[PDB]
């Protein structure tokens, strides 16, 4: 296809932008096409991949949130180049890069701020995936513990987190990014 072949121009950009060698990129492409012969990974295809890893819960919500960050050009598919860029950051990136990636995940509406509600959303999604837990203390729910973490990161108390607040906030309390395995 136009999307099934790995073109040199794609490799050039990927070796410029990522932590992968040309050899690794070519190897990854073989694996990408095995899982995705069309060269394009759909949202539901992405969800199915997560269901293989968390058969107990429902990883649908979390996978959809992650999908949007992989799909950086917002055309509704993950192409190989997008897959590799995201893999590079999340598996080989430095702390600042990983934190920025996590910020993009939490900023669901891409308005440049994380709200409490956005943070609730991701946390809920994670619990749906790995297993929800009953709380008998209304003062000690996930939302309330998140509120405390949020409040501590929200340095000017405007009820929203900038990238700088989240990134610096997470270096002192890495729990929101460790929750994505990015700390
Ligand atoms: O590990 C990531 C990126 N994750 C890390 C933290 C959660 C949010 C971003 N990619 N990924 C991944 C990780 C876990 C489950 C499914 C996937 S699909 C996939 C297919 C081939 C190689 C890597 C990946
Ligand atoms: Ca895309
Ligand atoms: Ca937002
Ligand atoms: Ca703020």
Curated annotation (Swiss-Prot):
Ca(2+) 1 binds at residues 71, 73, 75, 77, 82. In the embryo, highly expressed in the ventral ganglia. The keyword Zinc does not apply. Ca(2+) 3 binds at residues 154, 156, 158, 160, 165. Keywords: Calcium, Cytoplasm, Lipoprotein, Metal-binding, Myristate, Repeat. Binds 3 calcium ions via the second, third and fourth EF-hands. This is Frequenin-2. It comes from Drosophila melanogaster (Fruit fly). The gene is Frq2.
């Amino acid at each position: 296809k136009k999307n099934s072949k790995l073109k040199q121009d794609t490799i050039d950009r990927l070796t410029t932008d990522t932590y992968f060698t040309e050899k690794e990129i070519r190897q990854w492409h073989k694996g990408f096409l095995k899982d995705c012969p069309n060269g394009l990974l759909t949202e539901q295809g992405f969800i199915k991949i997560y269901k293989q890893f968390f058969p107990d819960g429902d990883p649908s919500k979390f996978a959809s949130l992650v999908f949007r960050v992989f799909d950086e050009n917002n055309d509704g598919a993950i192409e190989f180049e997008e897959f590799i860029r995201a893999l590079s950051i999340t598996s080989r990136g430095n702390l600042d890069e990983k934190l920025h990636w996590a910020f993009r995940l939490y900023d669901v509406d891409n308005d440049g701020y994380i709200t409490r509600e956005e943070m609730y959303n991701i946390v809920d999604a994670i619990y749906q995936m790995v297993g929800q837990q009953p709380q008998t203390e209304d003062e000690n729910t996930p939302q309330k513990r998140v509120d405390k973490i949020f409040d501590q990161m929200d340095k000017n108390h405007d009820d929203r987190l900038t990238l700088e607040e989240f990134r610096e906030g997470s270096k002192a309390d890495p729990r929101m990014v460790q929750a994505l395995s990015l700390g």
